[PDB]
Amino acid sequence: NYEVKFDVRQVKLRPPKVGKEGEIIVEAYASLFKSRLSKLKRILRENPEISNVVDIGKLNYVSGDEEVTIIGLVNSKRETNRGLIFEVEDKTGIVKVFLPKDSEDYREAFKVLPDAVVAFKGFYSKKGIFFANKFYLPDVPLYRKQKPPLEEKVYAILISDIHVGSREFCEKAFLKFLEWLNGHVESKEEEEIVSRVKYLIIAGDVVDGIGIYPGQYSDLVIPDIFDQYEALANLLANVPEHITMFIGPGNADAARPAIPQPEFYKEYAKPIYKLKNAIIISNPAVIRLHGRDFLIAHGRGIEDVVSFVPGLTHHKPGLPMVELLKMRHLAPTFGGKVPIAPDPEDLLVIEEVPDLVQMGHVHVYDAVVYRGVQLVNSATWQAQTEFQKMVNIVPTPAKVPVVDVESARVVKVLDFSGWC
Amino acid sequence: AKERKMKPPVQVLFPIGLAGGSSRDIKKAAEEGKVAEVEIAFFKCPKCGHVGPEHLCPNCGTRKELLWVCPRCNAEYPESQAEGYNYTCPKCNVKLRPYAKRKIRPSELLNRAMENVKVYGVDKLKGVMGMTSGWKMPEPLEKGLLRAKNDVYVFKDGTIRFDATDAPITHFRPREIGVSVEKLRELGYTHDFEGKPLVSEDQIVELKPQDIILSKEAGRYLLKVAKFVDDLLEKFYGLPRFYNAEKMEDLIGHLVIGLAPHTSAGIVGRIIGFVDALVGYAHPYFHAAKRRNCDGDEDAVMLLLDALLNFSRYYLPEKRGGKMDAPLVITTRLDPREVDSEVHNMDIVRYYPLEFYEATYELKSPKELVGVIERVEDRLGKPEMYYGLKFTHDTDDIALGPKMSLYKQLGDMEEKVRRQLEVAKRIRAVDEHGVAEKILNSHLIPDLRGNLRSFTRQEFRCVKCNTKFRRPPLNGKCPVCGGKIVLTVSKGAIEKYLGTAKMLVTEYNVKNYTRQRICLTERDIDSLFENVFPETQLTLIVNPNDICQRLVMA
Amino acid sequence: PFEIVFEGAKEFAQLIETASRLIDEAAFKVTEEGISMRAMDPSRVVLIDLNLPASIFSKYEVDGEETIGVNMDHLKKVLKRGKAKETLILRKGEENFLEISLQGTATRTFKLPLIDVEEIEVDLPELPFTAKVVILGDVIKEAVKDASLVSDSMKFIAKENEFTMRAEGETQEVEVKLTLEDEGLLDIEVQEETKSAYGISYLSDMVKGLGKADEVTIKFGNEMPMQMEYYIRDEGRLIFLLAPRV
Amino acid sequence: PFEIVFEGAKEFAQLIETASRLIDEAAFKVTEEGISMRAMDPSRVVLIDLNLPASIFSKYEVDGEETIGVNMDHLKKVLKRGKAKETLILRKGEENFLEISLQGTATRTFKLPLIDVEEIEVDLPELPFTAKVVILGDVIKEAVKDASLVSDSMKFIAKENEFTMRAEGETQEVEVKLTLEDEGLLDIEVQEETKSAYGISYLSDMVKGLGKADEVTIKFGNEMPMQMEYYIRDEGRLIFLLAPRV
Amino acid sequence: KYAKEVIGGRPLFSDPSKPGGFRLRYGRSRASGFATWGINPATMILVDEFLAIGTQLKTERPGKGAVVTPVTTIEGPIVKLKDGSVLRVDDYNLALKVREDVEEILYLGDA
Amino acid sequence: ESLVGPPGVAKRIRELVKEYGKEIAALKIVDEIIEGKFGDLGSREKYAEQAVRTALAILTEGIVSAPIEGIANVKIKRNTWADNSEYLALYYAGPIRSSGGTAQALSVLVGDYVRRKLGLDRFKPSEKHIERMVEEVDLYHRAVTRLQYHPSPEEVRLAMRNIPIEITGEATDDVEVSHRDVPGVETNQLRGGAILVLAEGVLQKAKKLVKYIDKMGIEGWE
DNA sequence: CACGGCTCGGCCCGGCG
DNA sequence: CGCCGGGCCGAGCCGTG
Ligand SMILES: [Fe+3]
Ligand SMILES: [Zn+2]
Ligand SMILES: [Zn+2]
Ligand SMILES: [Zn+2]
Ligand SMILES: [Zn+2]
């Protein structure tokens, strides 16, 4: 009982023509942030606490004593001695907001990423500034209905960052994973788990790719992108046919050079499509398993959250995931180290609050629940790269999160690093 | 051997602001009669009380005293007064500025200029958008008119420079440089390098230290500088002409200050002829004392009386002392002692001795035999540093050979690489078919990939509100402007080298890694835009054997 | 080693311009039957087919058959220097030059170094063309210029006894209908419903150089290339082949 | 839901251009009496007053009264595509589009999405105008083009039975005198000495589009705005109102 | 080092220390010597006129950055004409005469 | 004398070079500078300025603009983190790269000598000084411009511990650093002047440098 | 440190007139 | 023959490599 709920192939986009090609693009990014502002705006306006919403351009028509709420894109974010000075911009115009140091959501406003959609409750000074008292992120429902329990326990497993072909690939540990699913386990408990795992998921970088960075060629055991995906097919082929696999690209696969990513290039990735028991999904994607909502991303933007949030350090990668879940958007940064492809309609936005969040691409294992959400980072299968050494990276290879479907929760953090 | 044109070409140092348009052409601002607001310095006629940015009075013709300004109280004080006040206001505790953002009537000024120097037929007179000097004292317009009238350009100090790749010589056959043996007898050259009396135009003379053989480019431009300096002596200063140059061969004997970049001490030199190539020759003591490396370095060459008449530190920009600088002082006598180091190793032997040639075979390091072969360190101190050098190999001409590289007559990268790599099939040595590509092919891969990575992280910018929002405004309008925002790194840039780089891969055996990288980057360029530039125009003749598709069919 | 004499050099220069605005080089298959041209754009989107029967020339002297290779740009500037009625002559002997002689009030001689042209021959005979229409020149010329306002892709719709053109952009809409009843529509041959779309740019390159006294043929089918044709002095006509879009 | 039929589309496009060169958008107050226009430049320096009595139209069908809101630029490109004698038609039904039908040799249909125009109505009736002169079109057109040489502000001087224009720059001087005796000065109505100055740019936007067979009216007083007028097919005339300088 | 970077349009004249590149001759002509080289103008023409009088060709042995300057006495290229004949081409004018038939430049000759 | 003065200094420099050469006559002139033979400069930092400029000028033979374009300033500071003792702080500028490593390196030597003649103390950086400096090394080499010689970090701290004078100046690029707001370093950006003088100078040409130490017999450089 | 693309005025038209 | 809307080019003018 699976379902590919959200998929970027599933939706269709249409370019709005206006001799110069550039004029059509610029427009295209404009439409992108447009659909952003509409989507997140709508989500904030589904909040009960948020009332008296107004256009920012009309803040002159509202009294300095009427309590109004504004929803807008955070242009900039400048902290000072008395609080924070934002420049929120909605579809009408631009306004500079202030939050005092001693408001309740002041930490929240401290950890918000620029270019997001936020909501403010407060009072617009006639001086040309909006003095806010309350901060608002699209965030998540605080009281969510439980679900009907399932007929019996069934499991799904988390993995990502296979990075096939790179000589850093801890092939042996992965091989003992494949044995592990195949019942050749060492406890009766793990045999019951394996008895009932029906689902496997893989969130990007399933081959280490080609030309991903200067000197990748030194590291490639298999310097042939075709052979990377093909050999990957030969690994995953040994999966028991009574499990279903879902696979999504990353920034290393043969997929789009920005996000979102519709799918693997069929020309290069044909070998894995041929798999009978796998289902190739997009980035991001969302899969409803027995009514369970699994948000799946490869999560380029965690590098953004840690890039802009001093006070979130590595080895604790549940925190950035909590950030991205809190802004309901998978990479609301722009122009940093995550590439956002000029489409019309932002597909990245976390539309529905899901049950569970899977990411990867930093290989630092972590799990954390926020407001009934199971954030989890399926770390890797790659030992630390020399390149990862030069950038101060420390993998946690061969760590496999085990998840029950029913409670939508991580149950058993396997570790196989002893086989690498 | 180009000229030295500022990036916006300049012809007079007079701030004009926006009032001239894009190229800050002052004469447009004049005939258009606009009025300017530019920081400038004004002087005040003590006799009459006239005020204006010029040096001499219109009323009475005496020198005008500088006017100082408080930026707070806007107080104006003649020079001696602000000398007393130590250039700080009496009722303001602030330093007195020399200049102020002011109102300039380009019309009446330029009219006074044409009235003064008697020149009217100027096509344009390109000015300076804004004085960057500390004083921001402007050049007199008359000099700008004379520059324009002769079409010579100016550089930041007020001197006219002329870059030329410099190369060394030490002996020259007067046939080569086009000079009469009697003339050379007039410059001092008595006897050729073997001491024999100079009688014929085919004896190798020894170049004396500070002579230089300019390229006929430099003749053809410095000639214009000569007509400038004459017309400036006469029409503006009211003096006798000085060069009387009519052909380039009139300049022979007139001094030119050779100046490097990066330095501030130029060397006086003398011109003794011309050649045809684009390289200004000189005795290596010259090229060294000018601090050159002569590993391809490029140098400036201004005329003497020009740099005297037209230079003043007041024009020197105040902050960015860059890669070029101005002749703060000029040397008039080489001494190869305090010149440089790299000269001190030249081989000045008439022929390398037998002991050397046999001494190479066992790969002796060079210092193991420095005592054998004469050098320049082995003549310092003695008077015979200048007297006699030598050289092993004769040339026939110093200029014989193709006088302009084929690189500059090649327009399109598409066939740029086709020439660049056209050659390498010809030679035995290069072995293109595998490495001229792959080295060069590696370069193609890096630029395209870099642009592609960057594109998704770019910035935006309007033509009129330079302010580029790190994001598109949903409206597409702009501040101040009601206009549109242009894209910084345009999609024409990403696709600029696919034609070549695809060509190389379809022709030359290149390692599969780079091939798959390139076809793969093709697919990435397409799928990066599968939702803005959809696939619309079908084509009728499909697959002319493209390496990408025919590769994938494997 | 031939010589050729054609009158009304300005006309010939016009048509050579027409061929010029799409390709940059091309070869002329001169045969004793006549002068022939055939080439395709760089984009592989349009096919120019020039056919010149020797009859059109006031004098036609070919000895054998040979292929000329010329810079269409240089020839375009040259021929463009001819005028209304001055006589055109094309001579070629042993050397690798083409001699163009413009003699009206006086004689003027030009020489053009012939250039090798790598020939990619793709002959495309009659194809399944659902509809076929003849129409005055300025009709289509006006129409294309109109579609230039609102979009970059002009859509053609051929229905029974009725020919209609259209194009739509963001907001604006452009439509041009006309039938046999209308004056400018000389003929319609409707087999059934036909519809296509074409690059308005390419069409603009096509129809420029058309007076009101210019009849044009158009064969095409549902989502397939157009073939346009028009005669030149009633003997040698030119034919373009434009691939559709989408 | 109206329809309108006007002949000589090129003329109407010319006048719409005239209105176009000063404002970018504008609304058309269509009434059963006729089509009306009234708007002001961005600079608040000139007032364009268009008056179109229904009589001028070969057919005039209005059902009620409504205001059209159109992009003067888009309409300008559209109408500009009409020619000398082809017939103009303006249709509007339920939807929010304007349908322009150019039918000469053929019919061509365009559609323009109407745009909302925030109306700032400033009606300025007759005002104290000291002098009032009629003059041929090309006279003033030549004159303005002359003052373009020497300056940017053209000065007008009206004396008893004599009309003189002038402008001065840095050294150049331009003067244009003419009286009732002269041919081009059809009329002068001198109440007393009048003098003003006006932006030569704005005047250039005004008088462009004037043949020799164009009569122009000019009312104005000492240091106050000019009002220019000229008729269109003898029924509906256009009137500009230009604020002076200094 | 010199072959590390290859900008487009910048030719490569000989692989490092490969026999067929600029055969070496110690010496110091009238022009050269400070830091430049000399070179037979024939080899400046048979390379299709890329090199000029001063084009800084990046060297490898003696030091990066040698300017070029003509020296007619040293020995220029050895070429292979299209018809198979092998020709020693020492002087300029002969190089102009046979630049068109150069099927292969065996030896760039002196420096 | 005409580049950087002081007045009359040429007459003396010709003699002193007549007896001792270039290098030695440099230091002799330094002495007569601080001894006031050419008149009073005023404050101690003005004597520092004059002697440093004339020194480096005579050393590079006055043909470059390091003595003018390069050395931004000269200051006297205190080891306020270590013991509050005085030391000498040199403010370079980016154009010093133009005059190459050697002239850069000699700028160190004079900077060491002058403060000694002025009875000043050695410099004693804290580890935040040192590590911020090495950070400047890696970033400046990585992104701004590739140094001719890229030294290891240990070598960098070596110099940082072993140069008695401060190699500093105004920051040259908009590149923020991690060891922000170190005592006395009034900017948290990369200082390409101090960086280049550090790496391409004393490091890249330490051989020739100790050649000048040997020719001048100046202690403290073993 | 150096190249190409992109857009901008200034001449240079061909067609309407 | 004039004008005027388009064409072609020289000029910034940027960017990035
Ligand atoms: Fe990863
Ligand atoms: Zn990844
Ligand atoms: Zn006076
Ligand atoms: Zn004051
Ligand atoms: Zn703007």
mmCIF file of C-alpha atoms in Angstrom, chain A residues 208-346:
data_model
loop_
_atom_site.group_PDB
_atom_site.id
_atom_site.type_symbol
_atom_site.label_atom_id
_atom_site.label_comp_id
_atom_site.label_asym_id
_atom_site.label_seq_id
_atom_site.Cartn_x
_atom_site.Cartn_y
_atom_site.Cartn_z
ATOM 1 C CA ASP A 208 29.663 9.730 -7.367
ATOM 2 C CA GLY A 209 29.340 11.157 -10.847
ATOM 3 C CA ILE A 210 31.711 12.960 -13.172
ATOM 4 C CA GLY A 211 33.421 16.311 -12.908
ATOM 5 C CA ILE A 212 31.623 17.065 -9.660
ATOM 6 C CA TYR A 213 34.624 19.023 -8.393
ATOM 7 C CA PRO A 214 38.288 19.600 -9.242
ATOM 8 C CA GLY A 215 40.180 16.352 -9.085
ATOM 9 C CA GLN A 216 37.255 13.953 -8.891
ATOM 10 C CA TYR A 217 39.107 11.845 -11.434
ATOM 11 C CA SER A 218 41.720 10.868 -8.890
ATOM 12 C CA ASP A 219 39.056 9.243 -6.765
ATOM 13 C CA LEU A 220 36.941 7.412 -9.332
ATOM 14 C CA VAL A 221 37.298 3.673 -9.200
ATOM 15 C CA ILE A 222 34.957 3.750 -12.187
ATOM 16 C CA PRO A 223 35.587 6.785 -14.393
ATOM 17 C CA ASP A 224 32.605 6.112 -16.651
ATOM 18 C CA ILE A 225 29.248 7.591 -15.676
ATOM 19 C CA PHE A 226 27.466 4.801 -17.524
ATOM 20 C CA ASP A 227 29.443 2.249 -15.590
ATOM 21 C CA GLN A 228 28.671 4.077 -12.362
ATOM 22 C CA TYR A 229 24.942 3.684 -12.776
ATOM 23 C CA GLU A 230 25.307 0.221 -14.263
ATOM 24 C CA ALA A 231 27.402 -1.194 -11.442
ATOM 25 C CA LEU A 232 24.970 0.489 -9.068
ATOM 26 C CA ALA A 233 22.280 -1.532 -10.812
ATOM 27 C CA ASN A 234 24.303 -4.652 -10.150
ATOM 28 C CA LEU A 235 24.394 -3.847 -6.467
ATOM 29 C CA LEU A 236 20.735 -3.010 -6.046
ATOM 30 C CA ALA A 237 19.635 -5.981 -8.162
ATOM 31 C CA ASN A 238 20.312 -8.313 -5.227
ATOM 32 C CA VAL A 239 17.448 -6.761 -3.236
ATOM 33 C CA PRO A 240 14.667 -9.192 -2.263
ATOM 34 C CA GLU A 241 11.817 -8.708 -4.700
ATOM 35 C CA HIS A 242 9.296 -8.419 -1.890
ATOM 36 C CA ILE A 243 10.519 -4.897 -1.064
ATOM 37 C CA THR A 244 9.870 -1.754 -3.095
ATOM 38 C CA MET A 245 12.639 0.787 -3.594
ATOM 39 C CA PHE A 246 12.345 4.486 -4.295
ATOM 40 C CA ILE A 247 15.350 6.417 -5.587
ATOM 41 C CA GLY A 248 15.864 10.118 -6.113
ATOM 42 C CA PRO A 249 18.740 12.099 -7.571
ATOM 43 C CA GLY A 250 21.080 14.407 -5.751
ATOM 44 C CA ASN A 251 23.557 16.905 -7.062
ATOM 45 C CA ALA A 252 25.899 14.187 -8.212
ATOM 46 C CA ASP A 253 23.592 12.059 -10.273
ATOM 47 C CA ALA A 254 23.013 12.434 -13.978
ATOM 48 C CA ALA A 255 20.199 14.866 -13.343
ATOM 49 C CA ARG A 256 19.437 18.537 -13.580
ATOM 50 C CA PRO A 257 22.182 20.963 -12.566
ATOM 51 C CA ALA A 258 19.850 22.755 -10.188
ATOM 52 C CA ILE A 259 16.818 22.003 -8.098
ATOM 53 C CA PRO A 260 14.237 20.760 -8.306
ATOM 54 C CA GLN A 261 15.237 17.707 -10.271
ATOM 55 C CA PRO A 262 12.612 15.931 -12.377
ATOM 56 C CA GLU A 263 14.369 12.599 -12.715
ATOM 57 C CA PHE A 264 17.484 10.786 -13.798
ATOM 58 C CA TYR A 265 18.477 11.336 -17.388
ATOM 59 C CA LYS A 266 17.042 8.238 -19.033
ATOM 60 C CA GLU A 267 19.937 8.077 -21.486
ATOM 61 C CA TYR A 268 22.492 7.634 -18.722
ATOM 62 C CA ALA A 269 20.391 6.126 -15.953
ATOM 63 C CA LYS A 270 18.576 3.465 -18.025
ATOM 64 C CA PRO A 271 20.176 0.576 -16.065
ATOM 65 C CA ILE A 272 18.413 1.404 -12.821
ATOM 66 C CA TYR A 273 15.076 2.117 -14.468
ATOM 67 C CA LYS A 274 15.229 -1.499 -15.639
ATOM 68 C CA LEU A 275 14.935 -2.640 -12.024
ATOM 69 C CA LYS A 276 11.688 -4.499 -11.498
ATOM 70 C CA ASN A 277 11.189 -3.727 -7.808
ATOM 71 C CA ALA A 278 12.320 -0.092 -7.741
ATOM 72 C CA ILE A 279 10.363 3.115 -8.287
ATOM 73 C CA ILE A 280 12.254 6.159 -9.505
ATOM 74 C CA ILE A 281 11.064 9.323 -7.826
ATOM 75 C CA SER A 282 11.910 12.980 -8.115
ATOM 76 C CA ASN A 283 13.720 15.457 -5.903
ATOM 77 C CA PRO A 284 12.045 16.337 -3.757
ATOM 78 C CA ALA A 285 9.326 13.760 -3.547
ATOM 79 C CA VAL A 286 6.653 12.641 -1.128
ATOM 80 C CA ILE A 287 5.458 9.088 -0.673
ATOM 81 C CA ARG A 288 2.325 8.085 1.213
ATOM 82 C CA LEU A 289 2.908 4.625 2.671
ATOM 83 C CA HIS A 290 -0.255 3.392 4.360
ATOM 84 C CA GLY A 291 -1.413 6.979 4.653
ATOM 85 C CA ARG A 292 2.045 7.988 5.881
ATOM 86 C CA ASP A 293 3.585 11.149 4.446
ATOM 87 C CA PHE A 294 7.280 10.765 3.696
ATOM 88 C CA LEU A 295 9.005 13.932 2.573
ATOM 89 C CA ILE A 296 12.161 12.905 0.751
ATOM 90 C CA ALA A 297 14.815 15.345 -0.293
ATOM 91 C CA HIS A 298 18.490 15.277 -1.002
ATOM 92 C CA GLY A 299 18.579 18.566 0.803
ATOM 93 C CA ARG A 300 21.212 20.771 -0.731
ATOM 94 C CA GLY A 301 20.080 23.603 1.535
ATOM 95 C CA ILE A 302 21.187 22.186 4.887
ATOM 96 C CA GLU A 303 24.524 23.616 3.819
ATOM 97 C CA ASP A 304 22.644 26.906 3.664
ATOM 98 C CA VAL A 305 21.160 26.682 7.152
ATOM 99 C CA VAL A 306 24.524 25.849 8.656
ATOM 100 C CA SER A 307 26.084 28.436 6.347
ATOM 101 C CA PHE A 308 23.974 31.271 7.732
ATOM 102 C CA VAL A 309 23.210 30.012 11.257
ATOM 103 C CA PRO A 310 26.226 30.180 13.600
ATOM 104 C CA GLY A 311 24.991 28.152 16.525
ATOM 105 C CA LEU A 312 24.248 25.093 14.412
ATOM 106 C CA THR A 313 27.352 22.955 14.026
ATOM 107 C CA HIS A 314 27.880 19.631 12.317
ATOM 108 C CA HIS A 315 27.467 16.194 13.912
ATOM 109 C CA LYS A 316 24.046 17.436 15.106
ATOM 110 C CA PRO A 317 22.342 17.669 11.715
ATOM 111 C CA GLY A 318 18.874 17.361 13.194
ATOM 112 C CA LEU A 319 18.894 21.095 13.876
ATOM 113 C CA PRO A 320 19.138 22.363 10.258
ATOM 114 C CA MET A 321 16.471 19.862 9.276
ATOM 115 C CA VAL A 322 14.332 21.408 12.000
ATOM 116 C CA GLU A 323 14.964 24.790 10.370
ATOM 117 C CA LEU A 324 13.932 23.667 6.886
ATOM 118 C CA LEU A 325 10.859 21.987 8.315
ATOM 119 C CA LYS A 326 10.012 25.146 10.213
ATOM 120 C CA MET A 327 10.103 27.370 7.125
ATOM 121 C CA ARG A 328 8.176 24.729 5.125
ATOM 122 C CA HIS A 329 10.574 25.265 2.233
ATOM 123 C CA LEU A 330 13.478 23.106 1.181
ATOM 124 C CA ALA A 331 15.979 25.734 0.248
ATOM 125 C CA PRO A 332 14.618 29.255 0.638
ATOM 126 C CA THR A 333 18.105 30.673 0.378
ATOM 127 C CA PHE A 334 19.051 32.005 -3.041
ATOM 128 C CA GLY A 335 22.405 32.606 -4.666
ATOM 129 C CA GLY A 336 24.360 30.705 -2.048
ATOM 130 C CA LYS A 337 25.591 27.181 -2.471
ATOM 131 C CA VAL A 338 22.272 25.655 -3.487
ATOM 132 C CA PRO A 339 21.258 26.157 -7.145
ATOM 133 C CA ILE A 340 17.591 26.941 -7.827
ATOM 134 C CA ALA A 341 16.611 26.293 -11.431
ATOM 135 C CA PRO A 342 14.470 28.993 -13.051
ATOM 136 C CA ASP A 343 11.107 27.371 -13.288
ATOM 137 C CA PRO A 344 7.831 29.261 -13.005
ATOM 138 C CA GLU A 345 6.425 27.596 -9.890
ATOM 139 C CA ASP A 346 8.475 26.771 -6.788
#
